[PDB]
Amino acid sequence: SYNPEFFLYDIFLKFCLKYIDGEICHDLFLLLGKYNILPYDTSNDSIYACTNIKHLDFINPFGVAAGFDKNGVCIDSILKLGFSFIEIGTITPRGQTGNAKPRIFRDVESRSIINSCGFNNMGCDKVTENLILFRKRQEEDKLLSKHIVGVSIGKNKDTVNIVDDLKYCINKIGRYADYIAINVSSPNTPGLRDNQEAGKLKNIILSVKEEIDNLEKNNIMNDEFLWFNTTKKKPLVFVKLAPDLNQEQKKEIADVLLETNIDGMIISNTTTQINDIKSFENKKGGVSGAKLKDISTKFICEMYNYTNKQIPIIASGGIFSGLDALEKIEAGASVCQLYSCLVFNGMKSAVQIKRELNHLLYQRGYYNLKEAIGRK
Ligand SMILES: Cc1cc2nc3c(=O)[nH]c(=O)nc-3n(C[C@H](O)[C@H](O)[C@H](O)COP(=O)(O)O)c2cc1C
Numbered sequence: 515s516y517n518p519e520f521f522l523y524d525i526f527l528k529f530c531l532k533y534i535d536g537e538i539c540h541d542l543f544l545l546l547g548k549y550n551i552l553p554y555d556t557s558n559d560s561i562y563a564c565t566n567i568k569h570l571d572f573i574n575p576f577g578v579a580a581g582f583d584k585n586g587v588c589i590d591s592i593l594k595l596g597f598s599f600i601e602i603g604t605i606t607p608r609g610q611t612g613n614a615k616p617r618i619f620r621d622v623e624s625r626s627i628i629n630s631c632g633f634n635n636m637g638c639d640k641v642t643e644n645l646i647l648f649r650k651r652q653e654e655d656k657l658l659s660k661h662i663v664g665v666s667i668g669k670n671k672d673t674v675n676i677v678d679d680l681k682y683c684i685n686k687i688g689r690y691a692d693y694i695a696i697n698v699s700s701p702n703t704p705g706l707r708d709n710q711e712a713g714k715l716k717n718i719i720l721s722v723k724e725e726i727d728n729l730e731k732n733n734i735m736n737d738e739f740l741w742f743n744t745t746k747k748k749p750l751v752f753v754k755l756a757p758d759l760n761q762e763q764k765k766e767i768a769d770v771l772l773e774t775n776i777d778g779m780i781i782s783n784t785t786t787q788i789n790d791i792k793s794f795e796n797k798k799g800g801v802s803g804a805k806l807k808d809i810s811t812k813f814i815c816e817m818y819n820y821t822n823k824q825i826p827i828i829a830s831g832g833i834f835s836g837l838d839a840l841e842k843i844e845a846g847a848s849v850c851q852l853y854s855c856l857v858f859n860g861m862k863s864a865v866q867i868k869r870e871l872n873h874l875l876y877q878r879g880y881y882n883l884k885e886a887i888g889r890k
């Protein structure tokens with residue numbers, strides 16, 4: 515399934531990656547998608563690649579990670595590139611400016627990115643208005659039917675007691691989200707990763723699940739009209755975890771996820787422990803991309819064992835090829851998120867990655883994608 519539209523953007527891609535600033539590249543991409551002039555991938559997806567996380571049914575196992583469309587101003591176009599879902603955010607109750615620019619740097623040779631954004635977003639209220647507009651468009655557009663939209667949530671920079679910010683987001687945007695991702699792993703908000711302590715993380719998770727469950731109580735109508743999302747059901751609850759933890763921490767947090775019955779785990783966020791990128795020596799922030807590939811996959815194996823395979827995994831980190839996706843899936847992941855791939859490969863990310871994984875699934879001997887989960 516070629517397309518003359520995907521190719522023209524590869525021409526622009528080589529230019530931008532070589533001269534234009536990363537965040538400027540991001541703004542242009544988002545701006546083009548805002549006006550619905552990005553290519554489409556309206557082909558039927560392989561039934562062998564369909565996946566699910568409990569009652570969440572994904573048409574294919576590739577979405578866009580958080581931090582890409584932080585404000586939900588580009589949902590329709592990005593999804594129509596060929597992705598099955600998108601994770602908007604991370605959002606905070608009040609929009610922030612973030613750290614000072616430049617805050618995004620690219621090492622083309624190593625296919626790596628380092629960023630110190632600091633949760634720059636428009637705020638929960640405005641992003642909610644955008645998401646409502648999208649759900650209205652989704653009702654009238656076939657290319658958006660059955661596509662998923664998750665919302666990554668966090669805290670404002672100054673707001674102490676992160677629980678309060680989360681409850682506000684839940685109570686304003688919860689009705690329109692298919693799943694909620696708790697971000698306690700961003701390295702650009704000081705001390706957020708200190709909240710991954712078993713006790714703290716327990717109260718955070720339990721408060722989110724309770725707040726989601728409480729929106730349903732005082733409702734006047736049926737559930738079909740309350741949940742204006744894809745599932746027509748209350749959003750699942752996922753947690754996004756950082757890879758820079760020791761084994762003791764890793765096992766107890768996994769124990770907390772079992773006790774609290776979390777719906778999923780997103781492995782993983784960016785890392786701060788990489789020191790082998792010469793261009794990023796004097797740069798602050800977390801690094802993403804290829805140099806994060808092998809590190810995150812291990813973490814998935816370490817966690818897929820710590821939770822006794824009872825909590826599904828969502829893979830994110832250094833996924834650039836179809837074989838990378840299968841490496842993540844056979845390690846224990848059910849779905850994959852692409853971020854740096856879109857940065858370095860552009861519009862062809864979804865169509866390319868989905869084809870490559872399809873060919874590899876049958877060669878390795880599988881009836882469908884599920885058969886591969888944790889087979890390693
Ligand atoms: C510029 C930039 C901004 C990001 N913003 C967020 C964010 O707001 N929330 C979040 O959970 N992750 C954020 N991330 C992390 C990505 O979502 C993803 O977990 C990570 O980059 C690994 O993806 P990759 O290896 O395929 O590039 C951001 C990453 C980058 C590079």
Ligand SMILES: Cc1cn(C2CC2)c(=O)c2nn(C)c(Cc3ccc(C(F)(F)F)cc3)c12
Pocket residue numbers: 523526527530531535536537539540542543546618620627856857858860861
């Ligand atoms: C999507 C994306 C994001 N970001 C930062 C947040 C991390 C980058 O730095 C990027 N660099 N490229 C090259 C992209 C992707 C891209 C492709 C095509 C164009 C266009 F053809 F329109 F010119 C523009 C941009 C980036």
Ligand SMILES: O=c1cc(C(O)O)[nH]c(=O)[nH]1
Pocket residue numbers: 581604629630631632633634697699700701702783784800801
């Ligand atoms: O989770 C996150 C958040 C940010 C940010 O918005 O600053 N950046 C990342 O690399 N990861």
